[PDB]
Structure formats: structure tokens, C-alpha cells
């Protein structure tokens, strides 16, 4: 009794989700990652210095992050100690990746599963507009919204809706439950956040070299000497600030408003088992030196929280298009494709299935904001404490698709804030007359290396086994490989698979729900499958 929705539109990559229904509820979800490149293959026998470049091309939505885990993984097999100045640049930059990535993911990739652009054409400007100020410490003039409305009015007058063409909220959908006023508020931002997103990137270019796909890191870390001028340490901050206002006075508010009118979603999204590596290290060989705490949460118990141990993490196949069925931890992993056609040998996805201890685990911000929470990180709580309230729920409400979604606003906060410190710190030593970027290093006869990045979608880890300055094995496990991606040998469903199950669907022919849960996990199939 299966519904299929290939492609999953507003995401990155090619995702096919097939669901089976039993009277309004999902009963079996399948995450079918549908394209393959195979970079780990391409990489064999090259100089590990090059690697950081190939992999960076794992994807471009989540630009840079694959660069990082790559600089970091060799730095590790080489055992370099990069000038803390370099530590500063790299975490500075990651911070913007968060800002940009998330800003453009709620509005531009998640909104429409909630907002009813159409609906807005109704909405009373003066009304919606007056709502604004009540919700945001930002004066939203009737003229503004009044424009937006005509700007969309002219979308019907044109005959072409382009982007909105076969929209699931066209002619109203039962599942879209927003006051026309709110939509005219949402949309107005959607369109703005399209402008901000430039800035959020313009600033990342500064350290970064260019946005998208970064060019400023090296084993020995960082090369951008020019970015040290105060003349340029200023130019960042000024962008940094304005992108931060938007995010604070606007992305944060809307997540809240909408999340309001959709409180029932706080009761749907069935996930247990979270984990994180942590990010923004202060000493590069200590996960415990990271701004955002590294931690593991089994089931839903926010009271245990044990240490992340990368020993017991081994991708699987069996229900993946790769030879055999046996599993391996990165450092000893293999990558030679099968392809059995679709459900062939029961295989359905190009993504290997990275099982933790033995269990599935959901990485990303939810896991992040749970791990932080369960460990005093102050800014994290101060953040939820308010959400959880504005909403008027409890911890278990965080375990939902509403949680998962919400958490992502917070993560972008518990980072947008911090950025402030690192820039300062950097500007300090520059002023000092300390401009150390890059450290001299050398290749051991042979070594092993591993770099953990907690990418905007979670726990990223690159893993190198080098022999004589040539790559002997450079395999990688990426967030989305955890979240989306097949079942294991022990047929355990995956984060999202289970999240889909029990999801009620009001209209199969236009299933907004399939999409609200899959988009909450910000699926990135190009990464996932690499």
C-alpha cells in the first residue's frame, strides 16, 4: 500500500522515499539514496594533501566542512600543532557555515512545508503587519508586507508560478493550518533571507577565499594571511553582526510563531539514540576542548550522556548497493559497488549504514542540543528554556519533528553568539604582532589520521591511512549517512525511517507530512553517499 515520492524536491541530492500506508499512517518508510559518485575510490593513491580538495566536493550546500575534516585528518596522521591563530580562523569560518546553512534551510528549504504562499494573497497588511512588531523587535511597515502581497499578486498575473507550480498547498490542503496573516509574514522574510544569505556568505569569503567551496586551509592549517589586516577583521564583524540581527530578530521569531500553530508536530518524529563529536576545538587533540560538548545520549535519557568513542562505529551494507553484507569500522572499510536494481537482494540505497555501537543513532542538531543540554552548556539551555516555554511544552516535546526542527534555530544561535569571542581573540594576537598561520610538518613512514567535524547536519568524520605520503585508504562517514541511509544487517531502521512510521497523511496525492519530517533532517544525499 505504498506511496512513492521521488524526488524529495527541496533538499540536496537525489532522495526517493517510498512509504506503505495503513489507514492514514505511515507503516514502513524506505530511504533510497539514488545517485553515486564514489570519491573514496577516486582518492586511492594520491597525496593526502590533495584529498581536502576532492572531498570538499562531496557537496556545496554544506561547503567547506569536508575541507575541514580533511585538513584535520592529515594534521592528525602527521601530528601537527597548528598556530592557534589557525585554530581561530577555521572555527571562525565554520561558525558562518552554521549561520548561512541554517538561515537558508529554514526559509528556503523548510518553510513551504508549513507556509501557504497562496493563502497570503488574502491577508490584511495592516493586520499581518501589526502582528509583526508584536513578534519581532523590528518595525515592519504595512508598506513592506503590502508590497510583498502585490509582488506575489503579480505571480498569478504572469501565468507562471515557476517554483510554486505544482505546489502542495495550491487550492488549500487540510494540513496547512496558518492564518493568512502569518503566511504574509513568513513569505516577506523568505524573500529577504534570500538577500541576507548573500551577506552570511560574503563574510565567510573573507577568511575562506570564496563562497561556495573554500580555499584557505592546508595541512599545517590556513594560508589566508591577508585576512589578518584589522582593515579586514572589521569588514567581517560588520557583516557578522547584521547577519546575526536578522537571525535573532527574525529567523528565531518565525521558527517560534510557526512552531506555535503546528504544536501537534511536537508529538510526531520517533527517534532515540543521539550522539555528537563536538565542534570549535581550543586544542586540536581534545574533543573536550570544544565549545559545544561532545556527547552520547542513548534512547531519550537526557540524564546519562556518556563519551563519544569512535571505535564502535562501523558502516554496513546488506541493504546497500555494495558487495557482500559484512561490516567495517572506517579505518578498515571498503568501497566497491554492487547495484541490484532497486529492492534487489532487498538493497535500496547507495548510502552505507553507519551503525554506532550496534544502534542506528540520529546525529545533527537535535542530538547536538540534547547533548549540550544534558551538560550545562549554559547558552544552550537559556536557549531551549525559552523555546520550551514560548511554546509551553517539556523536554519530550523536543524529541519530535517539532523538536528536531526547533533545535536547528537554537544551534545556529549557540554559535552565532560564540563567533563573537573567536574573532576578538584573533584580533587580539594580531594586535599583539602574532600572525602565525601554518606550521612546518613531515610525513611519518606511515601513519593513521582522523578528523571530526560537527557539520551543520551533524557528526562528520574523515579517516586516513597513509603509507609514504600517498593515500592507502581515505574513507568517510557523513551525518546524512546516519540520519538517512539503509537498515543494517540487524535490519534496524534508520533515524528518519523510524521517524516516518506512524506519520498521518491527509492526502496521499499531496503528502506534505512525508516532507516535513524528511526536511527536518536536512537530507544531503551527495554527502551521504559521497
Amino acid at each position: 500500500n505504498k506511496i512513492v515520492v521521488d524526488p524529495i524536491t527541496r533538499i540536496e541530492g537525489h532522495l526517493r522515499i517510498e512509504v506503505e500506508v495503513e489507514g492514514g499512517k505511515i507503516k514502513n518508510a524506505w530511504s533510497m539514496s539514488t545517485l553515486f559518485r564514489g570519491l573514496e575510490m577516486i582518492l586511492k593513491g594520491r597525496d593526502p594533501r590533495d584529498a581536502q580538495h576532492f572531498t570538499q566536493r562531496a557537496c556545496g550546500v554544506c561547503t567547506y566542512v569536508h575541507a575541514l575534516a580533511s585538513v584535520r585528518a592529515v594534521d592528525n596522521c602527521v601530528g601537527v600543532k597548528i598556530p592557534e591563530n589557525a585554530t581561530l580562523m577555521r572555527n571562525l569560518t565554520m561558525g558562518a557555515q552554521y549561520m548561512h546553512d541554517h538561515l537558508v534551510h529554514f526559509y528556503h528549504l523548510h518553510a513551504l512545508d508549513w507556509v501557504n504562499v497562496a493563502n497570503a494573497l488574502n491577508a490584511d497588511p495592516a493586520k499581518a503587519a501589526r502582528l509583526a512588531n508584536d513578534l519581532s523587535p523590528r518595525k515592519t511597515t504595512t508598506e513592506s508586507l503590502k508590497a510583498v502581497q502585490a509582488k506575489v499578486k503579480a505571480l498569478v498575473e504572469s501565468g507562471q508560478l515557476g517554483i510554486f507550480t505544482n505546489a502542495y498547498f495550491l487550492g488549500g490542503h487540510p494540513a496547512y493550518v496558518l492564518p493568512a496573516e502569518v503566511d504574509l509574514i513568513a513569505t516577506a522574510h523568505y524573500l529577504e533571507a534570500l538577500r541576507v544569505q548573500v551577506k552570511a556568505a560574503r563574510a565567510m569569503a573573507i577568511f575562506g577565499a570564496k563562497n561556495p567551496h573554500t580555499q584557505f586551509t592546508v595541512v599545517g592549517g590556513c594560508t589566508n594571511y591577508d585576512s589578518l589586516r584589522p582593515e579586514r577583521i572589521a569588514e567581517f564583524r560588520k557583516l557578522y553582526k547584521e547577519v546575526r540581527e536578522f537571525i535573532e530578530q527574525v529567523y528565531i521569531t518565525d521558527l517560534l510563531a510557526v512552531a506555535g500553530f503546528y504544536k501537534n508536530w511536537a508529538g510526531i518524529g520517533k527517534t532515540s539514540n543521539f550522539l555528537t563529536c563536538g565542534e570549535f576545538p581550543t586544542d586540536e587533540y581534545d574533543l573536550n576542548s570544544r565549545y559545544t560538548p561532545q556527547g552520547v545520549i542513548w534512547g531519550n535519557d537526557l540524564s546519562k550522556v556518556d563519551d563519544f568513542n569512535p571505535d564502535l562505529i562501523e558502516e554496513h551494507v546488506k541493504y546497500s548497493w555494495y558487495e557482500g553484507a559484512d561490516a567495517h569500522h572506517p579505518y578498515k572499510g571498503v568501497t566497491k559497488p554492487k547495484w541490484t536494481e532497486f529492492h534487489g537482494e532487498d538493497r535500496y540505497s547507495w548510502m552505507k549504514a553507519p551503525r554506532y555501537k550496534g544502534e542506528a543513532f540520529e546525529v545533527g542538531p537535535l542530538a547536538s542540543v540534547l547533548v549540550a543540554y544534558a551538560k550545562k552548556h549554559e547558552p544552550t539551555v537559556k536557549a531551549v528554556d525559552l523555546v520550551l516555554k514560548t511554546l509551553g511544552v517539556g523536554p519530550e516535546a523536543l524529541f519530535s519533528t517539532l523538536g528536531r526542527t526547533a533545535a536547528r534555530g537554537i544551534q545556529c544561535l549557540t554559535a552565532a553568539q560564540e563567533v563573537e569571542v573567536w574573532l576578538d581573540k584573533l584580533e587580539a594576537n594580531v594586535k599583539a604582532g602574532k600572525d602565525d598561520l601554518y606550521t612546518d610538518w613531515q610525513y611519518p613512514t606511515e601513519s593513521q589520521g582522523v578528523g571530526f567535524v560537527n557539520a551543520p547536519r551533524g557528526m562528520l568524520s574523515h579517516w586516513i591511512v597513509q603509507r609514504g605520503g600517498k593515500i592507502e585508504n581515505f574513507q568517510h562517514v557523513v551525518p546524512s549517512t546516519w540520519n538517512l541511509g539503509p537498515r543494517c544487517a540487524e535490519r534496524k531502521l534508520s533515524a528518519v525511517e523510524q521517524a516516518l512510521i506512524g506519520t498521518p497523511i491527509a492526502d496521499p496525492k499531496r503528502p506534505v507530512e512525508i516532507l516535513r519530517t524528511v526536511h527536518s533532517y536536512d537530507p544531503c544525499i551527495a554527502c551521504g553517499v559521497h
Binding site: D6, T9, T34, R37, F54, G60, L155, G159, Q160, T223
Partner: protein, 262 residues
Amino acid sequence: AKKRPSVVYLHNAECTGCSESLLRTVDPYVDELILDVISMDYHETLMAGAGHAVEEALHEAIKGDFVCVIEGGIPMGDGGYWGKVGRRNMYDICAEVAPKAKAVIAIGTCATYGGVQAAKPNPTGTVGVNEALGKLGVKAINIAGCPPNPMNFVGTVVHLLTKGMPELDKQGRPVMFFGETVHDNCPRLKHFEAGEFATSFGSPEAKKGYCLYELGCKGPDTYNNCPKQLFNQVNWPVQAGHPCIACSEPNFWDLYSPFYSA
């Protein structure tokens, strides 16, 4: 129906660098564009519907006067079954659509030349756009680079519906942008000609702006406009004291590497 020129944006075996890079247009902002300028008739990253609803869209879309934009390069592979959408292979979806457009334009070194995926051993045997849809009479205009820089794209399409089929170079790249090399317009030229290079990233020379020939820079053999338009209206690889890797040359991955030598 009416308004602006129908554009069909197809996502093959890409990484979304090129789509993201597109959102970065300025002057022609993405809002102005996607609204008062073009009419993004089909684009999987921004489409409000999903699955079936959008398939119907493309269908109708590729019925009119449209410009095809193909991001990625196709897994022609040991079948071509490496990339499927709607359950159909990426070649097939392409053979279908490309041939019906007033003009096709391949974005990023993947679409154009073959990209990351096509590097040795090329397990998916992926190839460039008009090196696969050629036999079908497709002669795409290549907007090279990994990824290409807004204006090279935008400026290129603008040029289309305005003036016409842009004069192209040997590698099928608009000469109005890929004319000159990177080196030609690079500031550290002075040092190249004077013989002043950096021998390491952490070095006095490096810190004072010495040319990168040494360190591995490839501006010499790379035609792009980066030095002069430059990314996010704020920088470029060399300005950031990092070697140029020939990210817009037909076989950079396997050609112009090791990227830290020569």
C-alpha cells in the same frame, strides 16, 4: 502563461556547488531574477511541490521555448544507472529535455567537462554534457569552474535572450569571461616576473605576498576571470595566499595535480 523566458534547471551527478553559487548573484539578485527576470520553471532544490507534481511540471515546461541549464555531467556508466530521478536514469532524462531547448548551458566543470566524479578510475564513468548529448545535436555553452561564479552564468544567460549565442573558446567557454588566464590578471605577477616566490606557506615571503608558482599554483595554465571580478565581491584564492588549482580546466583533478607542486 507568459512573462519571462522559461528555464529548466536539471541536476545530474552534481554536488550543488553550482546551484548554491547561483543564489549568490548580485546586481541581478536571485529574487529579481527568479521573479522579474527569468522564470525558473523547474529546479529541484527550490520547488514547492515534490515527486509527481513536479514531474508533471517539467513535462509541461519542456513544451515551450525554454533554456536548459544542466548541472553535473552524466553517469553514462556500466548502464548509466548510477543517477536516477523519478526512477529514470540521468542520461535518459537528458536525452529527452536538452534536445528541445532554444539553448542549453552546462554549469560547472562537472556538467561541462566531467567533474570530480569523472576522475580516475571514474567508476561511474561520468562524462560532460555535450560530450554525451552531442550525438543528439546538443552543443552546450560551457560555464566552467568548480563552481563558476554567478556573473559567468547569469551574465551568460542575460547575453542569450539579449544579444545572442556568445563567442566561445576551444573548450566551449564564453571568451567574454574565460578569454584570459588567471595568471594574466594576477597581482603577484610582479613576483613571478621578478622571481620572487614563497617556498612555504609559513614564511616571510609567503606572508608578504610572494608568488605561488612554487607552492603549486596553476594560474599559468588556467583561463578564468577570478583575479578581476572575484568571488562574493570580496576575495579570491590567491588573494587568500592559496595556490590556484585550475578548477575550470577540463581535467584538473587528474591533470593539474599534485596541487602542491609545479
